[PDB]
Amino acid sequence: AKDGPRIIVKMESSAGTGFYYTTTKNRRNTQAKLELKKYDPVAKKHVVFREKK
Amino acid sequence: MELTAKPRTPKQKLDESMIAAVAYNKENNVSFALDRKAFDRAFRQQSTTGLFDITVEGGETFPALVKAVQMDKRKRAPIHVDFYMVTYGEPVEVSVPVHTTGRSQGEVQGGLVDIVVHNLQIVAPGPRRIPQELVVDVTKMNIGDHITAGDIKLPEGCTLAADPELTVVSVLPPRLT
Amino acid sequence: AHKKGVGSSKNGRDSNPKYLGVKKFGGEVVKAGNILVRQRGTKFKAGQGVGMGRDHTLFALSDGKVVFINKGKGARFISIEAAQTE
Amino acid sequence: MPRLKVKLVKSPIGYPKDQKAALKALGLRRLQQERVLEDTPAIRGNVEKVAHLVRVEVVE
Amino acid sequence: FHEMREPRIEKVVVHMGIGHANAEDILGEITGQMPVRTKAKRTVGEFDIREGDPIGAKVTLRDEMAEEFLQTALPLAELATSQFDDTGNFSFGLDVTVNLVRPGYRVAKRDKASRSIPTKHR
Amino acid sequence: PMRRRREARTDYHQRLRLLKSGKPRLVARKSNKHVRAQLVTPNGDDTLASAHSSDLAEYGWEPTGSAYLTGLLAGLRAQEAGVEEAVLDIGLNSPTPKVFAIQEGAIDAGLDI
Amino acid sequence: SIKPTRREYISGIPGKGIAQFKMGNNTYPAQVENVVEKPVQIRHNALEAARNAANRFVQNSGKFRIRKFPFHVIREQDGDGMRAPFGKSVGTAARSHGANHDFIAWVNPDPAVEFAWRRAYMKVTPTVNIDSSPAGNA
RNA sequence: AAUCCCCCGUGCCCAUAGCGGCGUGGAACCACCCGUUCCCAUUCCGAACACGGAAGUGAAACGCGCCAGCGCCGAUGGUACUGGGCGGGCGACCGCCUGGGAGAGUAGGUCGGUGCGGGGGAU
RNA sequence: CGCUGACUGGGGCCUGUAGAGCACUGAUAGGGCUAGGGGGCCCACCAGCCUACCAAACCCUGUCAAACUCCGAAGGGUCCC
RNA sequence: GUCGCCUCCUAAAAGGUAACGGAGGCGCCCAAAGGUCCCCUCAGGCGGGACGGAAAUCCGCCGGAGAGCGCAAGGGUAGAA
């Protein structure tokens, strides 16, 4: 998107490998290297999910 | 005094020499009668300031007359009045005037004057029991003084359908005090 | 290379609110009443409003849709006599 | 069955849209002509609105 | 009915609060109903401009508890006069108040028919 | 405010929450002195005195049991009617240990909740 | 009836600049007054004035009361020339709704004030109506 | 057990039920109440939420009644505005003919009306 | 395709200018009650005192609003008959 | 000068319309204003007391919510967002 080194930075998150990812917008603003949550890659379902990229 | 009509004809009526005016009374009404010529005379006297009544079929010779109306129109010539009597001993809604004299205090010496947002006095003394002309003027006037409700000074019939402290009549600088 | 002031001059753009389907017509599982999108429809007609009473839409199917406050979200069912046994 | 008998007057030339329809409706071809109908508030209405349109007569 | 108006406790606070950490801990030991509220404003009448800080201390204490306090705390205060305010209630000292409790007090608590507490009962 | 926005305490709307649907308003009206619930179901529905502390006297087992039974039974009375799966009605306060009690009733009452 | 841009974006929230209401003196009955019939964004200024000159010629007792007051205004030449016209304000008043209760020469027997107002009408602008009130003028 | 009086859960009509002034009720009802080990529980205390239980009380919330002062409701006859038709004035505008016809303004009206169930109260 | 169409009669459901209205809001005038500034007086840390000048807010008499409206029509709409 | 887009007014009352006609906001953001389950009852005014004399902090009364909601308006609306 409109890449603006302004606390506005786009990122994703793997599925422990579940394989690929899924969309997400972000803001250093707070918690830098902070970013985790679960989902479900083509890999079965669910799976921890770090976001960092 | 007299005034007739009551069918169902306001336009033409509301025209010529006869002005509408409902026959209003606690419990019943009856087509508008009267006339644009009587209103005159009488009204001219002092509508809701004294009271009388007219003989339509000797029907019911009672008082109460007007409790509403208007010379509305621009021209300033009324048309479409309200009429309500009172053959009861409940007479409240009674709004009769009150006059001073000229007592010299701020005027004939201080030139000063006085506003009278009052004049009238909607109260409720002894039903069918009021002096068409009640006067009360303890005098006093000038500087930054003022008198209103509260003080006042009511005779006989102890009503006051009104309140205390409020638009009585004060003395202001017709020029400067 | 900028813009100016003291020229307020600031036209406004377009909207498109409505009551679509108004009150009491052939009811179709589709946009009920509208004046606040993202809306959250309801059940049958609506009668709640900053007015007092209520409004029936002698039209019944799945559901309709609200407008956020205005109108008055549905809930006071009202399938309509035209919802009995065939 | 109050049967109504109206005639044609003051050409609707350029006059209100609808009004005209009420014309072709009630059944109004050429000018200053005469037609009749049943009271029927329907037909009635229309015509009336058309009022000034021409002239109504209670006939049969 | 003289068995009415005739009193029976009703609340009674006792607190303090400075444009600030712990001082309320000296508060906890004297009783047991910690007050945690946030004063504020935005000026320099003390250096208290900070309009959103936690300095307000208020150790609520009606009935039961207050009793132990009214008790062990009523001796060191020397006055008994004036400090008597209208609304059947009063406030002395480093910060303390207590309210009367005539029979027509509560009702003023209802969300409904909230009788604006008549002035002949209180 | 509108009648229900100047008083205080209730939540009726947290009743209408379940109103939407799910089943009978297995609404349980409490008053310590005892517990009383009905069964407001959608459509200007009604009820069937399914369980009350008086209906069968008020016993002498306090909270505990009371419920334990009032419910059960209740549940018994209804499933005779022809209900089945009824939605719960916290009527008021938080599913207090009472509440929870009655609750049991239903459940044990076999009237699914 | 072209009127202004808003009560706080263009020009709304003023004192309009004028010379207040009441003058003369009381009076319970005597109904002495003035009103109109003409429609016109009553010329503020012209207004303010007028009425005043009224006092200028009398002085004291005669309800020099007056029930008017402008509160909106026009605009015109300021900027380019004639085309896309922004707006420069000036001259507020109030609509004299085709006649109505003007100002009052109210008092017992004091025509020495009737003539006044009179002088007051003369002035004004939109013709004016010379009149009396409930009862007349004594 | 398929009638009225009462209280209790409680619903519809979004104040003709609100405010408040005086009053009445506790056999029954309901609350306040009596205590706090354990269920749960207060950012502070079992005030509120809460478990167990008599005595005490109707004070309080509360329920029925009376009171128009504040409010709420609100006609008839009536005036503005106007759909439609046609006239006057250069003029801002005025008027007529035909169906529609409010608010405010006096009368007065109101101190709810009515559902279902539960406890009784009427062999 | 064939009576569905402009239009009228009926029936619901809507919009809420004009008007009007003042409890929402913002004006605004005559005034009463009042505290803020006065102002003259004990010399005035007195924070005690009277009162004719300006006011805020509440109360009475009044009045303007397209970007105000507790109120509310003319009329237009839309589905059905 | 100005072009995009969000709101008011203009639109005459369904919807919708110029004007270089009125006024005002946006090319953000919030990882927790997210999802639910559980509790809360606003501004304000008045009356009484610490540090406090605008302007808190607590305690006791009054309240078609006038506060409340990251941002402009407008609708909403505590039952509550």
mmCIF file with all atom_site columns, C-alpha atoms in Angstrom, chain E residues 1-120:
data_model
loop_
_atom_site.group_PDB
_atom_site.id
_atom_site.type_symbol
_atom_site.label_atom_id
_atom_site.label_alt_id
_atom_site.label_comp_id
_atom_site.label_asym_id
_atom_site.label_entity_id
_atom_site.label_seq_id
_atom_site.pdbx_PDB_ins_code
_atom_site.Cartn_x
_atom_site.Cartn_y
_atom_site.Cartn_z
_atom_site.occupancy
_atom_site.B_iso_or_equiv
_atom_site.pdbx_formal_charge
_atom_site.auth_seq_id
_atom_site.auth_comp_id
_atom_site.auth_asym_id
_atom_site.auth_atom_id
_atom_site.pdbx_PDB_model_num
ATOM 1   C CA . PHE E 1 1   ? -44.671 6.664  66.218 1.00 0.00 ? 1   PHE E CA 1
ATOM 2   C CA . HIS E 1 2   ? -41.794 8.494  67.924 1.00 0.00 ? 2   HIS E CA 1
ATOM 3   C CA . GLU E 1 3   ? -40.291 5.179  66.788 1.00 0.00 ? 3   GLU E CA 1
ATOM 4   C CA . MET E 1 4   ? -39.410 6.760  63.436 1.00 0.00 ? 4   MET E CA 1
ATOM 5   C CA . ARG E 1 5   ? -37.531 10.040 62.964 1.00 0.00 ? 5   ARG E CA 1
ATOM 6   C CA . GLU E 1 6   ? -35.564 8.903  66.016 1.00 0.00 ? 6   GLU E CA 1
ATOM 7   C CA . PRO E 1 7   ? -32.091 8.123  64.517 1.00 0.00 ? 7   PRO E CA 1
ATOM 8   C CA . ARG E 1 8   ? -30.056 5.041  63.551 1.00 0.00 ? 8   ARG E CA 1
ATOM 9   C CA . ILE E 1 9   ? -26.606 5.673  62.029 1.00 0.00 ? 9   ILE E CA 1
ATOM 10  C CA . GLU E 1 10  ? -26.002 6.247  58.319 1.00 0.00 ? 10  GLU E CA 1
ATOM 11  C CA . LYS E 1 11  ? -22.613 6.452  56.588 1.00 0.00 ? 11  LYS E CA 1
ATOM 12  C CA . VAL E 1 12  ? -19.780 8.706  57.761 1.00 0.00 ? 12  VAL E CA 1
ATOM 13  C CA . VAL E 1 13  ? -16.552 9.324  55.833 1.00 0.00 ? 13  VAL E CA 1
ATOM 14  C CA . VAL E 1 14  ? -13.020 10.420 56.776 1.00 0.00 ? 14  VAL E CA 1
ATOM 15  C CA . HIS E 1 15  ? -10.214 10.988 54.282 1.00 0.00 ? 15  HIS E CA 1
ATOM 16  C CA . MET E 1 16  ? -7.588  13.279 52.765 1.00 0.00 ? 16  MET E CA 1
ATOM 17  C CA . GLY E 1 17  ? -5.795  13.857 49.445 1.00 0.00 ? 17  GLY E CA 1
ATOM 18  C CA . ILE E 1 18  ? -2.597  15.575 48.336 1.00 0.00 ? 18  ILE E CA 1
ATOM 19  C CA . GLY E 1 19  ? -1.236  16.301 44.869 1.00 0.00 ? 19  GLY E CA 1
ATOM 20  C CA . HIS E 1 20  ? 0.874   13.191 45.418 1.00 0.00 ? 20  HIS E CA 1
ATOM 21  C CA . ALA E 1 21  ? 2.148   7.029  47.325 1.00 0.00 ? 21  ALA E CA 1
ATOM 22  C CA . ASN E 1 22  ? 1.394   4.981  50.436 1.00 0.00 ? 22  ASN E CA 1
ATOM 23  C CA . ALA E 1 23  ? 0.272   7.757  52.777 1.00 0.00 ? 23  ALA E CA 1
ATOM 24  C CA . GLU E 1 24  ? -3.063  6.002  52.308 1.00 0.00 ? 24  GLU E CA 1
ATOM 25  C CA . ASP E 1 25  ? -1.222  2.964  53.648 1.00 0.00 ? 25  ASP E CA 1
ATOM 26  C CA . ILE E 1 26  ? -1.265  4.803  56.959 1.00 0.00 ? 26  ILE E CA 1
ATOM 27  C CA . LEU E 1 27  ? -4.950  4.985  56.063 1.00 0.00 ? 27  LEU E CA 1
ATOM 28  C CA . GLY E 1 28  ? -5.381  1.235  55.637 1.00 0.00 ? 28  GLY E CA 1
ATOM 29  C CA . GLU E 1 29  ? -4.026  0.416  59.095 1.00 0.00 ? 29  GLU E CA 1
ATOM 30  C CA . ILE E 1 30  ? -6.388  2.746  60.937 1.00 0.00 ? 30  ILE E CA 1
ATOM 31  C CA . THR E 1 31  ? -9.456  1.027  59.449 1.00 0.00 ? 31  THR E CA 1
ATOM 32  C CA . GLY E 1 32  ? -10.212 -1.199 56.437 1.00 0.00 ? 32  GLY E CA 1
ATOM 33  C CA . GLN E 1 33  ? -11.966 0.169  53.327 1.00 0.00 ? 33  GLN E CA 1
ATOM 34  C CA . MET E 1 34  ? -9.318  1.805  51.132 1.00 0.00 ? 34  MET E CA 1
ATOM 35  C CA . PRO E 1 35  ? -10.233 4.934  49.117 1.00 0.00 ? 35  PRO E CA 1
ATOM 36  C CA . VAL E 1 36  ? -8.795  5.137  45.593 1.00 0.00 ? 36  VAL E CA 1
ATOM 37  C CA . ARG E 1 37  ? -9.965  8.177  43.628 1.00 0.00 ? 37  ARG E CA 1
ATOM 38  C CA . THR E 1 38  ? -8.324  10.640 41.230 1.00 0.00 ? 38  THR E CA 1
ATOM 39  C CA . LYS E 1 39  ? -8.363  14.391 41.927 1.00 0.00 ? 39  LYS E CA 1
ATOM 40  C CA . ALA E 1 40  ? -7.231  16.829 39.226 1.00 0.00 ? 40  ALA E CA 1
ATOM 41  C CA . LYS E 1 41  ? -7.489  20.278 37.590 1.00 0.00 ? 41  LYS E CA 1
ATOM 42  C CA . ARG E 1 42  ? -4.907  22.238 35.600 1.00 0.00 ? 42  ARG E CA 1
ATOM 43  C CA . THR E 1 43  ? -3.213  25.227 37.223 1.00 0.00 ? 43  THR E CA 1
ATOM 44  C CA . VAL E 1 44  ? -0.328  26.181 39.535 1.00 0.00 ? 44  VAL E CA 1
ATOM 45  C CA . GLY E 1 45  ? -1.931  26.887 42.916 1.00 0.00 ? 45  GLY E CA 1
ATOM 46  C CA . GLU E 1 46  ? 0.354   24.224 44.368 1.00 0.00 ? 46  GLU E CA 1
ATOM 47  C CA . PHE E 1 47  ? 1.805   22.629 41.246 1.00 0.00 ? 47  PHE E CA 1
ATOM 48  C CA . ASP E 1 48  ? -1.359  20.589 40.637 1.00 0.00 ? 48  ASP E CA 1
ATOM 49  C CA . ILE E 1 49  ? -1.985  21.415 36.979 1.00 0.00 ? 49  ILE E CA 1
ATOM 50  C CA . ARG E 1 50  ? -1.849  17.709 36.146 1.00 0.00 ? 50  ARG E CA 1
ATOM 51  C CA . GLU E 1 51  ? -5.514  17.209 35.209 1.00 0.00 ? 51  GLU E CA 1
ATOM 52  C CA . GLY E 1 52  ? -5.710  13.410 35.533 1.00 0.00 ? 52  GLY E CA 1
ATOM 53  C CA . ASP E 1 53  ? -3.659  12.125 38.471 1.00 0.00 ? 53  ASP E CA 1
ATOM 54  C CA . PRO E 1 54  ? -4.280  9.716  41.397 1.00 0.00 ? 54  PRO E CA 1
ATOM 55  C CA . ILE E 1 55  ? -4.066  11.810 44.596 1.00 0.00 ? 55  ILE E CA 1
ATOM 56  C CA . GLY E 1 56  ? -7.608  11.769 45.988 1.00 0.00 ? 56  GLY E CA 1
ATOM 57  C CA . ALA E 1 57  ? -7.796  9.630  49.122 1.00 0.00 ? 57  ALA E CA 1
ATOM 58  C CA . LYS E 1 58  ? -11.128 8.676  50.687 1.00 0.00 ? 58  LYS E CA 1
ATOM 59  C CA . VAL E 1 59  ? -11.642 5.836  53.167 1.00 0.00 ? 59  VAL E CA 1
ATOM 60  C CA . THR E 1 60  ? -15.404 5.337  53.117 1.00 0.00 ? 60  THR E CA 1
ATOM 61  C CA . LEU E 1 61  ? -16.832 4.137  56.444 1.00 0.00 ? 61  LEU E CA 1
ATOM 62  C CA . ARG E 1 62  ? -20.484 3.966  57.446 1.00 0.00 ? 62  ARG E CA 1
ATOM 63  C CA . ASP E 1 63  ? -22.021 1.798  60.146 1.00 0.00 ? 63  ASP E CA 1
ATOM 64  C CA . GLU E 1 64  ? -20.112 -1.120 61.707 1.00 0.00 ? 64  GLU E CA 1
ATOM 65  C CA . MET E 1 65  ? -16.610 0.022  60.708 1.00 0.00 ? 65  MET E CA 1
ATOM 66  C CA . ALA E 1 66  ? -17.182 3.733  61.317 1.00 0.00 ? 66  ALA E CA 1
ATOM 67  C CA . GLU E 1 67  ? -18.293 2.620  64.801 1.00 0.00 ? 67  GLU E CA 1
ATOM 68  C CA . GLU E 1 68  ? -14.858 1.359  65.742 1.00 0.00 ? 68  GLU E CA 1
ATOM 69  C CA . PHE E 1 69  ? -13.596 4.711  64.417 1.00 0.00 ? 69  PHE E CA 1
ATOM 70  C CA . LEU E 1 70  ? -16.219 7.090  65.812 1.00 0.00 ? 70  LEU E CA 1
ATOM 71  C CA . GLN E 1 71  ? -15.018 5.302  68.923 1.00 0.00 ? 71  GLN E CA 1
ATOM 72  C CA . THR E 1 72  ? -11.222 5.115  69.035 1.00 0.00 ? 72  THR E CA 1
ATOM 73  C CA . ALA E 1 73  ? -11.081 8.389  67.083 1.00 0.00 ? 73  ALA E CA 1
ATOM 74  C CA . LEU E 1 74  ? -13.674 10.614 68.770 1.00 0.00 ? 74  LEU E CA 1
ATOM 75  C CA . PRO E 1 75  ? -11.500 11.447 71.813 1.00 0.00 ? 75  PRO E CA 1
ATOM 76  C CA . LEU E 1 76  ? -8.583  13.385 70.264 1.00 0.00 ? 76  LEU E CA 1
ATOM 77  C CA . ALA E 1 77  ? -10.875 15.889 68.514 1.00 0.00 ? 77  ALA E CA 1
ATOM 78  C CA . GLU E 1 78  ? -11.695 18.991 70.567 1.00 0.00 ? 78  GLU E CA 1
ATOM 79  C CA . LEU E 1 79  ? -14.593 21.200 69.445 1.00 0.00 ? 79  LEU E CA 1
ATOM 80  C CA . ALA E 1 80  ? -18.310 20.408 69.497 1.00 0.00 ? 80  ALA E CA 1
ATOM 81  C CA . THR E 1 81  ? -19.966 23.475 67.933 1.00 0.00 ? 81  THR E CA 1
ATOM 82  C CA . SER E 1 82  ? -20.650 25.535 64.792 1.00 0.00 ? 82  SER E CA 1
ATOM 83  C CA . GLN E 1 83  ? -18.985 22.896 62.633 1.00 0.00 ? 83  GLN E CA 1
ATOM 84  C CA . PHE E 1 84  ? -22.661 21.914 62.544 1.00 0.00 ? 84  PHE E CA 1
ATOM 85  C CA . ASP E 1 85  ? -23.949 22.243 58.987 1.00 0.00 ? 85  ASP E CA 1
ATOM 86  C CA . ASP E 1 86  ? -27.527 22.391 57.680 1.00 0.00 ? 86  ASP E CA 1
ATOM 87  C CA . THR E 1 87  ? -28.213 19.140 55.821 1.00 0.00 ? 87  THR E CA 1
ATOM 88  C CA . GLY E 1 88  ? -28.041 17.315 59.154 1.00 0.00 ? 88  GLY E CA 1
ATOM 89  C CA . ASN E 1 89  ? -24.332 16.622 58.796 1.00 0.00 ? 89  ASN E CA 1
ATOM 90  C CA . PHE E 1 90  ? -20.911 18.150 59.459 1.00 0.00 ? 90  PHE E CA 1
ATOM 91  C CA . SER E 1 91  ? -17.170 18.144 58.748 1.00 0.00 ? 91  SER E CA 1
ATOM 92  C CA . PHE E 1 92  ? -14.198 18.900 61.009 1.00 0.00 ? 92  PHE E CA 1
ATOM 93  C CA . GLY E 1 93  ? -10.455 18.167 61.113 1.00 0.00 ? 93  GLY E CA 1
ATOM 94  C CA . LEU E 1 94  ? -7.327  16.574 58.632 1.00 0.00 ? 94  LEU E CA 1
ATOM 95  C CA . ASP E 1 95  ? -10.457 15.716 56.652 1.00 0.00 ? 95  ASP E CA 1
ATOM 96  C CA . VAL E 1 96  ? -13.594 14.028 57.982 1.00 0.00 ? 96  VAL E CA 1
ATOM 97  C CA . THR E 1 97  ? -17.372 14.328 57.755 1.00 0.00 ? 97  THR E CA 1
ATOM 98  C CA . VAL E 1 98  ? -20.480 12.499 58.927 1.00 0.00 ? 98  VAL E CA 1
ATOM 99  C CA . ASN E 1 99  ? -24.095 12.756 57.840 1.00 0.00 ? 99  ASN E CA 1
ATOM 100 C CA . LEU E 1 100 ? -27.291 12.660 59.871 1.00 0.00 ? 100 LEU E CA 1
ATOM 101 C CA . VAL E 1 101 ? -29.877 9.954  59.263 1.00 0.00 ? 101 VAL E CA 1
ATOM 102 C CA . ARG E 1 102 ? -33.397 11.101 60.053 1.00 0.00 ? 102 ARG E CA 1
ATOM 103 C CA . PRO E 1 103 ? -36.083 8.696  58.761 1.00 0.00 ? 103 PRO E CA 1
ATOM 104 C CA . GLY E 1 104 ? -36.631 10.529 55.454 1.00 0.00 ? 104 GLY E CA 1
ATOM 105 C CA . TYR E 1 105 ? -33.055 10.187 54.184 1.00 0.00 ? 105 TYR E CA 1
ATOM 106 C CA . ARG E 1 106 ? -32.778 6.983  52.134 1.00 0.00 ? 106 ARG E CA 1
ATOM 107 C CA . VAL E 1 107 ? -35.574 7.520  49.583 1.00 0.00 ? 107 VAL E CA 1
ATOM 108 C CA . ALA E 1 108 ? -33.197 10.098 48.109 1.00 0.00 ? 108 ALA E CA 1
ATOM 109 C CA . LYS E 1 109 ? -31.389 7.012  46.812 1.00 0.00 ? 109 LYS E CA 1
ATOM 110 C CA . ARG E 1 110 ? -34.117 5.614  44.551 1.00 0.00 ? 110 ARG E CA 1
ATOM 111 C CA . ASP E 1 111 ? -33.761 5.770  40.770 1.00 0.00 ? 111 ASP E CA 1
ATOM 112 C CA . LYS E 1 112 ? -37.548 6.134  40.779 1.00 0.00 ? 112 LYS E CA 1
ATOM 113 C CA . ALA E 1 113 ? -39.983 8.352  42.671 1.00 0.00 ? 113 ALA E CA 1
ATOM 114 C CA . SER E 1 114 ? -36.791 10.040 43.844 1.00 0.00 ? 114 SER E CA 1
ATOM 115 C CA . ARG E 1 115 ? -38.442 12.254 46.457 1.00 0.00 ? 115 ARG E CA 1
ATOM 116 C CA . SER E 1 116 ? -36.092 15.255 46.433 1.00 0.00 ? 116 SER E CA 1
ATOM 117 C CA . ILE E 1 117 ? -35.794 14.609 50.177 1.00 0.00 ? 117 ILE E CA 1
ATOM 118 C CA . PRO E 1 118 ? -38.256 16.942 51.928 1.00 0.00 ? 118 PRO E CA 1
ATOM 119 C CA . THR E 1 119 ? -36.783 19.571 54.276 1.00 0.00 ? 119 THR E CA 1
ATOM 120 C CA . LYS E 1 120 ? -39.032 18.728 57.247 1.00 0.00 ? 120 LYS E CA 1
#
